[PDB]
Amino acid sequence: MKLTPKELDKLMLHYAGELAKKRKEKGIKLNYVEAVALISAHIMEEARAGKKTAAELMQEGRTLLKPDDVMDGVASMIHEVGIEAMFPDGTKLVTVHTPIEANGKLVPGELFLKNEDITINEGKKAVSVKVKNVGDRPVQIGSHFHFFEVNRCLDFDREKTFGKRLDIAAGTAVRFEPGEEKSVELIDIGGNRRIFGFNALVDRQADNESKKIALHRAKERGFHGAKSDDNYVKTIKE
Amino acid sequence: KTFGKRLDIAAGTAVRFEPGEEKSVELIDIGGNRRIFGFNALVDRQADNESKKIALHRAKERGFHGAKSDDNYVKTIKE
Amino acid sequence: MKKISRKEYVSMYGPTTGDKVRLGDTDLIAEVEHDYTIYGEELKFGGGKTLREGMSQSNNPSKEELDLIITNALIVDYTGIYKADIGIKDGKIAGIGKGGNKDMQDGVKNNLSVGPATEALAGEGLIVTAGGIDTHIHFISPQQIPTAFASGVTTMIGGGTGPADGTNATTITPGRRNLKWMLRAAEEYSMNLGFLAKGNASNDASLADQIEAGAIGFKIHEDWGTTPSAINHALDVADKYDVQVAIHTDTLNEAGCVEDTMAAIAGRTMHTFHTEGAGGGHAPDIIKVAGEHNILPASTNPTIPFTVNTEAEHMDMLMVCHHKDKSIKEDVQFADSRIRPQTIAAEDTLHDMGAFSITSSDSQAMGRVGEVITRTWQTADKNKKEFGRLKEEKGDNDNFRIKRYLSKYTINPAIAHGISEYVGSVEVGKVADLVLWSPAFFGVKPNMIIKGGFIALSQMGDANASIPTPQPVYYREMFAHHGKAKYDANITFVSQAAYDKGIKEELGLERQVLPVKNCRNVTKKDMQFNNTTAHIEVNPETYHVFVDGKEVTSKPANKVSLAQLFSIF
Ligand code: NI
Ligand code: NI
Numbered sequence: 001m002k003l004t005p006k007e008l009d010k011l012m013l014h015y016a017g018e019l020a021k022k023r024k025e026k027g028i029k030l031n032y033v034e035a036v037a038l039i040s041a042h043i044m045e046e047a048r049a050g051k052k053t054a055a056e057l058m059q060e061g062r063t064l065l066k067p068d069d070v071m072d073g074v075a076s077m078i079h080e081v082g083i084e085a086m087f088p089d090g091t092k093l094v095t096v097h098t099p100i101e102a103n104g105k106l107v108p109g110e111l112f113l114k115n116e117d118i119t120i121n122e123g124k125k126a127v128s129v130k131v132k133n134v135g136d137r138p139v140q141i142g143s144h145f146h147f148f149e150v151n152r153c154l155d156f157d158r159e160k161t162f163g164k165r166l167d168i169a170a171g172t173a174v175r176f177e178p179g180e181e182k183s184v185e186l187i188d189i190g191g192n193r194r195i196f197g198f199n200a201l202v203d204r205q206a207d208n209e210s211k212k213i214a215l216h217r218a219k220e221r222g223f224h225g226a227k228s229d230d231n232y233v234k235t236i237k238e
Numbered sequence: 239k240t241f242g243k244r245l246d247i248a249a250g251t252a253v254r255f256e257p258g259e260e261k262s263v264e265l266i267d268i269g270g271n272r273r274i275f276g277f278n279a280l281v282d283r284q285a286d287n288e289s290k291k292i293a294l295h296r297a298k299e300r301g302f303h304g305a306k307s308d309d310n311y312v313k314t315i316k317e
Numbered sequence: 318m319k320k321i322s323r324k325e326y327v328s329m330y331g332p333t334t335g336d337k338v339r340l341g342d343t344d345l346i347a348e349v350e351h352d353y354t355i356y357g358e359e360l361k362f363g364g365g366k367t368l369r370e371g372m373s374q375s376n377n378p379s380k381e382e383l384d385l386i387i388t389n390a391l392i393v394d395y396t397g398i399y400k401a402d403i404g405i406k407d408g409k410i411a412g413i414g415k416g417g418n419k420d421m422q423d424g425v426k427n428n429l430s431v432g433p434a435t436e437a438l439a440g441e442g443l444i445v446t447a448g449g450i451d452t453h454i455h456f457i458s459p460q461q462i463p464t465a466f467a468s469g470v471t472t473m474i475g476g477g478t479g480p481a482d483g484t485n486a487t488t489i490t491p492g493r494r495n496l497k498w499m500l501r502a503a504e505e506y507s508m509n510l511g512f513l514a515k516g517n518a519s520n521d522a523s524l525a526d527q528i529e530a531g532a533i534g535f536k537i538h539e540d541w542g543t544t545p546s547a548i549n550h551a552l553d554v555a556d557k558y559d560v561q562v563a564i565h566t567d568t569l570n571e572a573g574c575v576e577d578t579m580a581a582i583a584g585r586t587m588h589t590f591h592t593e594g595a596g597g598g599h600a601p602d603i604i605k606v607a608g609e610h611n612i613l614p615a616s617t618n619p620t621i622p623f624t625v626n627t628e629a630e631h632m633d634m635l636m637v638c639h640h641k642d643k644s645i646k647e648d649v650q651f652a653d654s655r656i657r658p659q660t661i662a663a664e665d666t667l668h669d670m671g672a673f674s675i676t677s678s679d680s681q682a683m684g685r686v687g688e689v690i691t692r693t694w695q696t697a698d699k700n701k702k703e704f705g706r707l708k709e710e711k712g713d714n715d716n717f718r719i720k721r722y723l724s725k726y727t728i729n730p731a732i733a734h735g736i737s738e739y740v741g742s743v744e745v746g747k748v749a750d751l752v753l754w755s756p757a758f759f760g761v762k763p764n765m766i767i768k769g770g771f772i773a774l775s776q777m778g779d780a781n782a783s784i785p786t787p788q789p790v791y792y793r794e795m796f797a798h799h800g801k802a803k804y805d806a807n808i809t810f811v812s813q814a815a816y817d818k819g820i821k822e823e824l825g826l827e828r829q830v831l832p833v834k835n836c837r838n839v840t841k842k843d844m845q846f847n848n849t850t851a852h853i854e855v856n857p858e859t860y861h862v863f864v865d866g867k868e869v870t871s872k873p874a875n876k877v878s879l880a881q882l883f884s885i886f
Contacts, residue, residue: 192840193610205584205611205840208852233301235580236279236545252569254647257857276519276546278572 010044010085017041029071032078035100039064040083043094047085054092061096067103075100076107124187126167131156132181134224140175143168147186148214149199155224162214163195163206164188199223213238241293242274242285243267278302292317318357330359330389331441333400337714338391338444341759343698343878348714349391352400353414358422360388360402362437367417370433375418378432381406385770386416386431387751390440394447394743395724395845398716403445403743403751404429408770408805410749428745444759446723447742448472448750448766449690450730453563453590453617453677455488456499461680462506464687466774467792469763470726471750474734474810475680476513476536485682487538487565488590491515493530500531500824503809507773507798509750511734511810511833513563516551517541524554528812531820533734533833534561539597544572545581552585560812561734561836563588566598566606568655575599575606584611586837588733591617592673593664595631596683600654602855604663604862607673610840610850613733615675616668618684620661622696625873628658634683660855663862665871668725669700669718671849672864674841675733676725689726694760695877697722703872717846724845732843735833736810748808761879769806769829771797804828 020038024030030038039061046052052060067075081096133139135153147161154176166174167185174184189195195202199221201214213235218226245253246264253263268274274281278300280293292314297305323336332338337348354360362368368388370376385405392399392413404412415422416429448471454461456477465473477484478495490499490512503510514527516535524535535551537543543565555562564587566578573581578599591597592607596617607614619634620627635641635656641648667673676693680686697718709717731741739748749770752763765775777793778785797806804827811820816832842848853864862869 192838192842194838194840207584207610209580210584232299234299235583236300236577237549237581237583252571254650256650276542277544279519279546279549282519282546 013037014041014044017044024065024069030065030069030074031071032074035065035070035074035078036081039081039096039099043083043096044085047087047092047094050088054087054094057094058096061094062099065100067101070100072104073106073108075102075104076110120169121167121187124167124190126185126187127160127164128183128185129156129161130181130183131176133176133178136178138175138177140173141166142173143170144189146189146195146198146202147184149201149218149223152218152221152223158218158223158225159211159215159227161186162211163193209235240265241290242272288314329361329441330354331391331400331443338756340694340719341757341761341879342882343694343760344701345694345697345715345719346713347393347398347719348712348716350397350399350716354389354400354402355415355422355424358415358417360386360417360431361441362388362439368431368437371418372421373417373431374435375420375430375432377420378434379419379427379430381411381427382430382432383411383416383435385436385438386429387438387440387445387753390443390445390753392445392743393719393723395720395728396742396744398719402429403440405749405770408749410743410745410747410751410770413743413745440753442756443764444754444756445743445751446754447727448740448752448768449726450474450736450741451678451680451686451689451726452588452675452730452734453488453615453679453684454686455484455680455682455684456490456512457484457681459502459506461686462508463792465678465680465689466508466766467763468687469690469752469754469766470508470686471752471766471768472509472511472731472736472740473686474511474513474533474730476515483540486540487536488513488563489515489517489536489538489541490532491527493526496527496530496532497824500809500811500820500826504804504826504828507768507794507803507807509736509740509808509810511736515541516555516562516564517543517547519544519546519550521550521554524551525558525814528554528558528560529814529818531811531815531824532560533736533810533812534563534836536563536565538565539568540565543567543578545577548578548581549583552582552587556585556837558812558814559735559834559837561588561833562586563590565590565596566603568597568600568603570599575603579606579609582611586611586613586839588613588615588675590615590677591620591679591683593617593620594660595620595635595656596679597655600651601657601660601860602857604660604667605853605855607667608851608853608864610842612841613675613839613844614667614673614841615677615730615733616664616673618676618678618686618689618692620664621668621676621692622699622877623662623665623871623873624877625875627661627873628656631656631661638683657860659860659870660862662871662873663869665696665700666704666869667864668696668722669704670864670869671721671847672851672853674725674729674844674847676722677730691761691879693722693726695879698878699874700871721846724847728845729847732839732845733836734810735836736831738834739808739831758883761883765795768797769808771795771802771806773797773803773806801827 016037020034043057083094084091132155134155139151141150144165147164164186167187193206195206201217215227216232219229243265246266272285274285280296294306295311298308332349334349334352337346367373383404383406387403402416404416412428415425417425419425449469450472451470452474454473454475476489490496511533513534513536514532516537592614594603678684678686678689707718728741731737740750751767753765755764772795775795776790778787778790808829811832813832821830851865
């Protein structure tokens with residue numbers, strides 16, 4: 001019966017679920033491991049039966065255990081239980097979000113933040129810019145992307161955003177639906193202000209002179225808002 | 239008019255131009271193999287009538303006063 | 318736990334936290350910011366003192382045992398001004414803190430353990446700083462070395478082949494053969510060395526070969542033709558080999574103006590020598606460059622500080638040089654379009670503002686390789702006397718300003734030439750190039766120069782006397798200056814490329830040979846306490862200097878400190 005190593009993985013999980021249930025049967029507050037295995041073993045069988053759809057099990061899994069069935073802490077712990085099973089249409093990923101509820105105090109590793117607000121990008125005075133997505137597709141820019149070089153679709157005053165980035169929490173971004181128009185905040189880039197990569201519009205020291213070159217480049221490359229060519233005076237290298 | 243030429247003066251000397259000043263300078267043609275490399279990067283090759291075309295075109299775009307004009311340039315396969 | 322007065326304590330271990338020292342005969346007052354010792358356990362060497370068997374000196378040292386301890390030294394460095402013991406092992410600064418014998422004293426890291434193998438150097442009452450690093454040297458004459466050395470400088474970077482006109486005019490050692498001669502010659506001296514090659518070439522092949530040959534970087538100079546071509550080509554190859562580039566601007570503006578030179582540089586890193594202008598460069602607005610981000614501004618020794626005599630002096634040097642005449646107008650014009658007393662005085666202040674970052678010499682060619690340190694402090698003294706203390710200054714001292722200038726000839730030149738990791742500041746892990754200063758003579762005449770963890774030069778008296786103090790007392794070569802010891806104590810710098818190609822074994826170089834690195838990712842913002850950028854203009858008519866709108870200038874001086882007071886000549 002050529003059992004794959006994946007199959008053995010599941011066969012083991014199942015008896016971890018079986019144990020899990022048999023314990024609840026005897027009436028015993030399940031724990032992190034037991035709760036998860038149980039939820040997992042369950043979904044597994046249901047997919048075997050070929051009845052419940054993937055979409056349905058996502059939920060039905062949230063009714064396998066009630067707050068009084070588990071130990072305090074378990075709820076705050078099992079944020080979610082992902083699991084794969086073979087449906088008549090093949091294996092599919094079922095994610096049972098928050099299966100049980102926090103009917104108790106104890107919360108492992110809980111955080112005790114201190115109400116107050118972190119002030120991001122200290123002293124980097126932002127600037128607002130009118131931006132509109134003239135294209136027919138979406139466009140989302142990251143927090144540290146040289147704004148001046150985003151999709152050539154976003155129309156706006158390129159000239160004004162040279163050497164700047166979206167003044168937002170590191171790692172996040174701003175979305176622009178086709179047609180949408182908004183005003184974004186953008187501070188200047190820190191460090192050595194050495195802009196290399198992106199759209200290849202700068203690739204050097206970001207200064208007022210490099211700027212001239214950047215606009216000229218964007219201009220010829222079709223980046224909406226890229227000012228204009230009021231007669232360029234090409235340097236010895238660019 | 240001064241392509242491939244240099245100030246016809248004693249080797250090592252120079253001619254000064256005060257801001258505003260205007261003068262007429264003498265200039266003979268460069269000797270040797272007339273291989274112009276360096277300077278402002280306007281030539282960097284054999285100095286001939288063809289390289290000239292390229293030189294003026296280059297100076298033109300680089301803003302060198304007097305650099306004739308772009309009466310529609312016909313870019314070569316390498317320049 | 319009986320206690321003792323401050324006056325006493327300080328005559329045994331030197332100044333402690335909160336105390337202040339006057340630097341030489343200047344008005345610059347430094348304050349001990351911190352002290353790592355433990356009052357009662359401080360280290361002392363002597364007849365019945367603390368550094369002895371079983372006591373301060375361990376009989377069970379750690380297997381890191383030091384080779385040398387500088388006791389109770391006051392460390393003046395861009396990293397701070399404090400009190401602490403310095404531990405030295407294997408030519409490197411192994412530790413900065415308490416140190417002594419853990420067997421008999423609390424708090425003593427094992428990288429500071431004192432055992433029978435460690436030597437003792439008293440530092441109480443003295444100030445310890447890193448060796449100086451002059452990066453604008455003309456290898457005109459080998460006699461410069463022992464001069465720069467006696468002045469607290471342990472590292473010289475520049476170019477040349479001896480008293481040859483090319484060298485007298487520029488800091489360049491051209492071609493791999495001449496690079497060979499110099500590297501092999503360097504074996505002889507007591508001073509880390511690095512050489513710059515001829516960047517005045519639009520030939521890429523010739524450009525990289527000099528690096529592959531041993532050069533730590535290029536030098537573009539006027540006399541060789543500092544054109545936008547040469548400039549552009551050099552820089553590119555410089556980017557590949559992660560090596561530095563120095564430059565002397567096109568004074569005659571023949572190829573273009575400072576605007577063009579910059580466009581040439583294309584925003585890449587650059588070490589600008591004598592950015593002011595007197596030492597040479599675009600007439601008359603070259604000094605403006607020292608405000609750009611991608612620039613590493615450096616000033617040349619001569620016009621520093623600005624004295625009532627500096628203007629007259631220079632006109633002479635510029636005339637004695639270049640072959641200028643008083644009766645010829647074009648000759649008087651060039652002289653006036655280069656020796657701007659305006660941009661000169663504007664300098665002293667630019668340094669004070671953090672606008673300028675490095676202080677060079679320009680030895681044997683409009684520079685005094687023996688007065689870089691002395692003059693760096695004189696200038697600081699003036700600016701305080703004329704502008705007062707600093708806004709950034711915290712407390713009743715000049716600490717901040719102090720670090721500002723120190724960095725100018727230590728950590729800043731070190732970074733500008735990729736050798737910051739090994740030298741350039743009193744920090745753990747770096748080569749032990751330290752110079753002990755006796756507070757009174759600070760900035761002028763140092764007590765002793767320790768090269769590579771061992772004493773190489775020190776004040777020495779009658780070699781026949783019963784002690785080292787009696788006269789005559791001049792600077793005598795010490796042990797790290799002789800035999801095979803010099804080789805262990807010195808370093809000749811090279812590029813990664815050469816280092817990798819085995820340039821050391823290649824040339825039979827018996828000296829420690831390291832390669833320079835991180836030269837292409839540095840900007841004006843990498844210059845310690847001298848990271849101020851700014852859009853500075855320069856009046857074409859009055860040669861007046863303007864920064865961020867306003868204008869800067871300093872007043873000349875009739876007298877300077879660290880001068881006639883200390884030398885018989
Ligand atoms: Ni120079
Ligand atoms: Ni020089």
